[PDB]
Ligand SMILES: [Zn+2]
């Protein structure tokens with residue numbers, strides 16, 4: 001099972017997405033969120049950090065009509081292994 | 093904390109294309125690697141690695157090392173490291189999602 005759970009888009013424009021997820025019981029210092037066109041190799045994805053107290057994030061600067069894969073990685077320590085990530089797909 | 097200048101795998105102001113010609117110089121093979129600082133934005137690093145051949149041609153891949161707010165670094169969001177030294181030893185033990193295991197600093 002993954003941390004967090006219930007990743008979903010909750011708002012969309014042609015160039016941005018708002019995502020939200022179920023607040024986890026376990027400790028989270030920070031999330032790492034990656035996004036990029038489905039099919040692209042992971043090493044070309046964009047990535048950014050949100051603090052472990054937020055349960056939403058905004059992804060902007062997207063191109064319309066593109067399939068994005070969005071993945072959320074929860075980190076329970078300053079350094080080390082994430083929990084099992086959670087991932088969704090969505091088209092702008 | 094100035095601990096990168098003695099590292100044999102660290103190359104100060106080295107461009108992506110100079111990293112490729114450096115890693116394609118004689119004496120390197122798959123696993124040969126370097127970390128370089130970006131020439132424009134100080135503090136942002138890349139990992140360049142000599143890959144497995146493709147279609148009898150030599151290959152060099154590049155990975156952005158990304159910066160944590162807490163000062164650490166990561167390539168894959170699945171594992172984060174307190175500095176470049178731990179990042180390098182981790183990917184020297186296993187490829188763990190990189191094209192190839194880091195095996196030898198780039199030979200000059
Ligand atoms: Zn729902």
Ligand SMILES: [Zn+2]
Nearest residue numbers: 037038039040
């Ligand atoms: Zn693409």
